[PDB]
């Protein structure tokens, strides 16, 4: 049994590779072929503790956990094969009041999902885990119906399923080489023979980086070491009739579960103490590594062993049977890379799983859907393989992975900041100047100003679930923009140059707005065939046939990949250049923006010559610039596109020329306060692959009646005719000392009916603003709802948008 032709080749037979093979086969894909080096489970999969919880600290990753567990419950019936899925429930423990607040944070984030999750009192915790030291226990975060599974049995069951639905699993059959073909397909080489695949999928665990390099890519992955300790039989544990639920001791930084009639616990030790396989990056994985472990090192986890011994006293007397030290393939931010890869044809990845056992199931069905449908079934850009780039070096990867390990169980605050591996090489000379004058935020390698320091006010990273040290400074920056004139570093924007004969036709088919006339810029959306908002851009028509597309920092390669695929798919004759790192951008915005800038250029910046949304090349003080009259602040302003090496000089000259006007800096936190007042939607919060543009309120940018048949046009017609079920609305609410940031539950009459997507304090009205999705019948202006913030429901009112009109809209009523 050998197939030389395959629809999809999956490289790697860990839980992830097998799960995917199963889903694709079951979903009806013919000639699915999986190639495994040695045997199924030979990588990290066989050694794992097998914890599978409904809990995730994120958002749509809850779906992945949800689908995994639901699958795992049904595999034994479906395949006729046991999986040893224990489901006593999981409890994360709170021993400080700040950790109780974290649970409240996580509850409002979880109440608008199907995932079942509660905060429980000590009494209840003690009932479920009677061997727990209750001295310090304040609360538990409890997910009933989950637990842990046997990684081997799971993978074996998934393999029988895959085989039952038509998949072919070959091993030993290592992939030794990979050659792309001009038609976009692949020749795959193994010792057993050649497969010509329409697409290939990397699922090769801690060999994923090596497989990537067969096709000239560098996957930012480093294998880390992780240990758990298995205890001998304990009388008090054997005596119990029901299994103990899975714990996490957050302050002690270890997970703990029942294993037979003993216990099993695995620490996440300090980032200073953890160990990883730097040698395996430099030299690759030792060949003949497989089905094997590293030497135990109890000494480096002692601090956490002791915290466990005191928290579960019974450990004190138990003996240790075994210690499992093995490798996990980490990416820098601890999350995997799951999706199709930019800059090559028909290569997909499902790699770098810190938590592969829990993610395998959901990721299989997710990737299957994306592969079969040409768009993801829900948004998981947080796992986009191309959120990383050239900046994500081996040195950055190593240091960030180390930090992500040691940070496994720290308190997760909103607006969290991490400093390992920073700054990357992805900076301009402007970084040296402004680093001491603000809190720099991390954005795909860039250092971007969040908020600026004020004399006689605390500057330090001071994270909180409530308002903190940046609150008043952000208010001043807000004033700065409304009253005077602010300067902001917008350099992180993804920037693409499109030209060639079919430039216009390509864009007209990609985007749902009309293509602007030369000299003009407009806001435009790339929709998926289902009519989901894959991206929000601005399109500048700079010279005939030649365009500049701008998108958010987090959307750079994500968007480029989509655009490049449409170009190749439709045989479009174009040249596409990623110029993200060649150019810097400065936003100058506020009433005195024209005044200040005019001083520095012979170009006429009067409202007469330079209309809103025009784009023009000029010089700002002998520095060449492409200036667009636009601002996501909604106030009068320009964005100044220039060479990266000119950012420092340009900035200097602008701040100098704005002396009179009391020019100053502003950052992204303030920007968010401004755009929200103007009712501007942000991609990733108000819309993404989970939303169509009509429910999100982007009607103004969607031209259904333009001749060209743009992607998603028909789905939109059909959606509109059917009538909307929900609508994005803008909410106001008085709060004590906490602002919505998005992802919070919206309640009405004792039931959750929707969620906030983003938020901010509005300094103009002295109330919190938020965007939220609610059912159409409750989307009327004036409607009262409640927003759940940090354990309290605050009443909220839907308001007429926008709260504040944009400067161009204000200027237009002056005449009228």
Ligand X SMILES: *Cc1cc2c(cc1C)nc1c(=O)[nH]c(=O)nc-1n2C[C@H](O)[C@H](O)[C@H](O)COP(=O)(O)OP(=O)(O)OC[C@H]1O[C@@H](n2cnc3c(N)ncnc32)[C@H](O)[C@@H]1O
Ligand Y SMILES: Nc1nc2c(c(=O)[nH]1)N[C@@H](CNc1ccc(C(=O)N[C@@H](CCC(=O)O)C(=O)O)cc1)CN2
Positions that interact with ligand X (CB under 6 A): 11-17, 35-38, 42-45, 47-51, 174-175, 203-207, 211, 226, 228, 324, 326-328, 353, 355-358
Q: In terms of DSSP bridges, do strands 494-499 and 726-733 run parallel, antiparallel, or are they unpaired?
A: unpaired
537 binds, among ligand Y, ligand X, none (CB under 5 to 8 A by kind): ligand Y
Give whichever of 362 and 516 is closer to ligand Y, judged by the CB atom: 516
CA distances from 452 to 14, 260, 475, 488 (A): 47, 55, 11, 11
Minimal distance, residue 591 CB to ligand Y, in Å? 17
Candidate residues 66, 112, 669, 680; the one interacting with ligand Y per rule CB under 6 A:
680
- Of 494-533, which residues contact ligand Y (CB under 6 A)? 522-523
712 binds, among ligand X, ligand Y, none (CB under 5 to 8 A by kind): none
203 binds, among ligand Y, ligand X, none (CB under 5 to 8 A by kind): ligand X
Work out whether 639 is an interface residue with ligand Y (CB under 6 A): yes
- Written as one string, the DSSP assignment of 178-205 is EEE-TTS-EEEEETTEEEEEEEEEE--G
- Nearest CA to 168 out of 27, 368, 15, 21 is that of 21
Asked if residue 32 lies in contact with residue 162, where contact means CB atoms within 8 angstroms, the answer is yes
- Nearest CA to 244 out of 388, 120, 394, 126 is that of 126
Say how far apart CA 177 and CA 378 lie, in whole Å. 33
Candidate residues 138, 217, 344, 613; the one interacting with ligand Y per rule CB under 6 A:
613
**CB count, 10 Å around CB of 175?**
23
Question: What is the crossing angle of helices 15-26 and 356-373, to 10°?
Answer: 40
693: part of which helix (H) or strand (E)? none
Q: Of 265-273, 315-323, 324-332, 624-632, which part binds ligand Y (CB under 6 A)?
A: 624-632
Q: Gap positions in the chain, given as the residue before each gap (C–N > 2.5 A)? A: none
Residue 671 phi/psi, 5-degree rounding, is -50, -45
702: part of which helix (H) or strand (E)? none
Minimal distance, residue 273 CB to ligand X, in Å? 16
Minimal distance, residue 451 CB to ligand X, in Å? 37
Say how far apart CA 328 and CA 402 lie, in whole Å. 12
Candidate residues 632, 669, 761, 773; the one interacting with ligand Y per rule CB under 6 A:
632
Minimal distance, residue 118 CB to ligand Y, in Å? 38
Work out whether 110 is an interface residue with ligand Y (CB under 6 A): no
Give whichever of 15 and 507 is closer to ligand X, judged by the CB atom: 15
Work out whether 399 is an interface residue with ligand Y (CB under 6 A): no
Give whichever of 11 and 728 is closer to ligand X, judged by the CB atom: 11
Which positions from 260 to 299 touch ligand Y by CB under 6 A, shown as an x/- string?
----------------------------------------
Contacts of 801 (CB under 8 A, 6+ apart): 679, 697, 729, 730
- Nearest CA to 565 out of 184, 24, 6 is that of 184
Minimal distance, residue 23 CB to ligand Y, in Å? 34
Minimal distance, residue 269 CB to ligand Y, in Å? 41
Say how far apart CA 724 and CA 729 lie, in whole Å. 13
536 binds, among ligand Y, ligand X, none (CB under 5 to 8 A by kind): ligand Y
Work out whether 538 is an interface residue with ligand Y (CB under 6 A): yes
Minimal distance, residue 54 CB to ligand X, in Å? 13
Q: What are the tokens at 789?
A: 């913030």
Q: Of 94-102, 416-424, 545-553, 566-574, which part binds ligand Y (CB under 6 A)?
A: 545-553
- Radius of gyration (C-alpha) of the chain in whole angstroms: 27
551 binds, among ligand Y, ligand X, none (CB under 5 to 8 A by kind): ligand Y
Give whichever of 366 and 641 is closer to ligand Y, judged by the CB atom: 641
By the criterion CB under 6 A, which residues form the site for ligand Y? 522-523, 536-538, 550-552, 613, 628, 630, 632, 639, 680, 806
């Amino acid at each position: 049994e050998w197939k030389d032709r395959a629809e999809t080749v999956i490289i790697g037979g860990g839980c992830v590779g097998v799960s995917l093979a199963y889903h694709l086969a079951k979903a009806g894909m013919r000639d699915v072929v999986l190639l495994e080096k040695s045997e199924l489970t030979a990588g990290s999969t066989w050694h794992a503790a097998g914890l599978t919880t409904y809990f995730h600290p994120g958002i749509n990753l809850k779906k992945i956990h949800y689908d995994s567990i639901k699958l795992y419950e049904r595999l034994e019936e479906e395949t006729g094969q046991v999986v040893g899925f224990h489901q006593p429930g999981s409890i994360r423990l709170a021993t400080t009041p700040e950790r109780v607040d974290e649970f409240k944070y996580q509850m409002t984030r979880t109440n608008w999902h199907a995932t079942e999750q509660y905060i429980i009192e000590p009494e209840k915790i003690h009932e479920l885990f009677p061997l727990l030291n209750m001295d310090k226990i304040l609360a538990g975060l409890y997910n009933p119906g989950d637990g842990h599974i046997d990684p081997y049995s799971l993978t074996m069951a998934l393999a029988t399923g895959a085989r039952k639905y038509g998949a072919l699993l070959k091993y030993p059959a290592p992939v030794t080489s990979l050659k792309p073909r001009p038609d976009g397909t692949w020749d795959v080489e193994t010792p057993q023979g050649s497969v010509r695949a329409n697409r290939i999928v990397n699922a090769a665990g801690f060999w994923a980086r090596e497989v990537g390099k067969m096709i000239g890519l560098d996957h930012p992955l480093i294998p880390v070491q992780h240990q758990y300790v298995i205890t001998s039989t304990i009388p008090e544990v054997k005596a119990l009739k029901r299994e103990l639920p899975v714990l996490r001791d957050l302050e002690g930084s270890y997970y703990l579960r029942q294993e037979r009639d003993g216990l099993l616990f695995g620490p996440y030790e300090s980032q200073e103490k953890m160990k990883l396989q730097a040698s395996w990056v430099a030299h690759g994985v030792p060949p003949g590594f497989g089905k094997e472990l590293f030497e135990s090192d109890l000494d480096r986890i002692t601090e956490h062993v002791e915290a466990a011994m005191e928290m579960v006293p019974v450990l004190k007397k138990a003996d240790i049977i075994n210690i499992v030290n093995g490798p996990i393939t980490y990416s820098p931010d601890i999350l995997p890379m799951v999706g199709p890869h930019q800059g090559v044809r028909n290569y997909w990845v499902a790699i770098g799983f810190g938590y592969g056992i829990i993610h395998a199931g959901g990721v299989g069905t997710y990737l299957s859907d994306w592969i079969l449908h040409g768009e993801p079934p829900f948004d998981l850009i947080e796992l986009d393989p191309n959120r990383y780039g050239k900046w994500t070096t081996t040195q950055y990867t190593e240091a960030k992975a180390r930090e992500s390990y040691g940070f496994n169980n720290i308190v997760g605050y909103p607006k969290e900041e991490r400093f390992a591996g920073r700054p990357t090489q992805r900076v301009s000379g402007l970084y040296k100047i402004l680093e001491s004058k603000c809190s720099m935020g991390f954005h795909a390698g860039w250092e971007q100003p969040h908020w600026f320091y004020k004399p006689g006010q605390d500057t330090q990273y001071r994270p909180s679930f409530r308002r903190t040290n940046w609150f008043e400074p952000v208010g001043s920056e807000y004033k700065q923009v409304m009253q005077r004139v602010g300067v902001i570093d917008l350099s992180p924007f993804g920037k693409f140059n499109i030209k060639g004969q079919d430039s216009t036709q390509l864009l007209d088919h990609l985007c749902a707005n009309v293509i602007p006339k030369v000299g003009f810029t407009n806001i435009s959306h790339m929709l998926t065939p289902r009519g989901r908002v894959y991206a929000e851009l601005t399109v500048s028509h700079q010279s005939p046939g030649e365009f500049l597309l701008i998108t958010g920092s987090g959307s750079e390669l994500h968007d480029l990949r989509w655009i490049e695929e449409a170009a190749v798919r439709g045989g479009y004759d174009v040249e596409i250049r990623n110029i993200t790192d060649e150019l810097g951008v400065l936003g100058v915005a506020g009433p005195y923006a024209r005044r200040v800038l005019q001083k520095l250029t012979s170009e006429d910046l009067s409202d007469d010559v330079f209309k809103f949304l025009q784009t023009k090349s000029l010089k700002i003080s002998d520095i060449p610039v492409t200036a667009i009259r636009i601002s996501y602040t909604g106030e009068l302003g320009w964005e100044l596109y220039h060479r990266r090496e000119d950012s420092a000089a340009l900035y200097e000259r602008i701040m100098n020329a704005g002396q009179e006007e009391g020019i100053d800096n502003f950052g992204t936190y303030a920007l968010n306060a401004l755009r929200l007042e103007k009712a501007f939607r942000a991609w990733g919060s108000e819309m993404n692959c989970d939303t169509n543009p009509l429910e999100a309120g982007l009607d103004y940018f969607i031209k259904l009646n333009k001749p060209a048949n743009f992607t998603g046009k028909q789905a939109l017609k059909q959606i509109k005719a059917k009538g909307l079920k929900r609508r994005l609305v803008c909410l106001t609410l008085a709060t004590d000392n906490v602002d919505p940031e998005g992802n919070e539950s919206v309640w009405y009459k004792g039931k959750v009916i929707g969620n906030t997507t983003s938020g901010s304090y509005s300094y103009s009205i002295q109330k919190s603003l938020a965007f939220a999705y609610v059912p159409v019948e409750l989307s009327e202006v004036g409607q009262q709802v409640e927003v759940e913030l940090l354990g309290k429901n605050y009443p909220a009112t839907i308001i007429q948008e926008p709260l504040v009109l944009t400067e161009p809209t204000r200027t237009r009523l002056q005449k009228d």
